[PDB]
Amino acid sequence: YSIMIQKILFKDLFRFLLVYLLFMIGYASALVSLLNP
Amino acid sequence: DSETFSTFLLDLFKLTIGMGDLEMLSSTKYPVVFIILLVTYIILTFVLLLNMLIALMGET
Numbered sequence A: 001y002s003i004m005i006q007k008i009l010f011k012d013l014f015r016f017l018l019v020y021l022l023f024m025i026g027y028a029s030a031l032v033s034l035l036n037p
Numbered sequence B: 001d002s003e004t005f006s007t008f009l010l011d012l013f014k015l016t017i018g019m020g021d022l023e024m025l026s027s028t029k030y031p032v033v034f035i036i037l038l039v040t041y042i043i044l045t046f047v048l049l050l051n052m053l054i055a056l057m058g059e060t
């Protein structure tokens, strides 16, 4: 189980995190730009 | 500082449940690293540790 967790953590979780980071930051930036003080 | 630890542990477990607020961080220096550490703590507890428990039952 530890070996499997290490395997999934490095390979699949790297791709998922890298996929999510730009999407999240850009979408949140878009929402922030939407608002006007 | 046993009393401080005793209080904070209850607060931290409550935050782990998903209810409460992290108001105690006012006395901390370098709050950013504390935020990051709590972020990673939540990520490990919810995403990886909890998921592996889910997976084990399915395969067995």
Ligand SMILES: CC(C)CCC[C@@H](C)[C@H]1CC[C@H]2[C@@H]3CC=C4C[C@@H](OC(=O)CCC(=O)O)CC[C@]4(C)[C@H]3CC[C@]12C
Pocket (backbone or CB within 6 Å): B006, B007, B009, B010, B011, B013
């Ligand atoms: C995730 C699994 C494997 C670990 C199990 C979690 C417990 C170790 C945590 C969850 C809630 C925690 C408790 C939350 C509140 C208290 C009361 C606290 O003493 C007090 O009464 C002062 C604080 C208060 O009165 O609320 C001492 C620790 C204890 C038992 C905490 C110690 C650790 C506990 C039992």
